[PDB]
């Protein structure tokens, strides 16, 4: 299905569009600040998921 980026709200450029390992949210690596130059190989959690951690 069509996930969208939390920052820019577009679902284009699938190749750069990170999925959150904890929910159905997404972010383009090029929209991320700080600079994310590549798709990380480990788990990645969006900011909404960080809010639920302890």
């Amino acid at each position: 299905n069509k996930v969208t980026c939390l920052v820019c709200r577009k679902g284009d450029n699938d190749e750069f569009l990170l999925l959150c390992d904890g929910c159905d949210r997404g972010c383009h690596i090029y929209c991320h600040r700080p600079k994310m130059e590549a798709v990380p190989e480990g788990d990645w959690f969006c900011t909404v998921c960080l809010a639920q951690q302890v």
Partner: peptide, 8 residues
Amino acid sequence: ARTKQTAR
């Protein structure tokens, strides 16, 4: 981490 492309 997986992308929208690697998941679809």
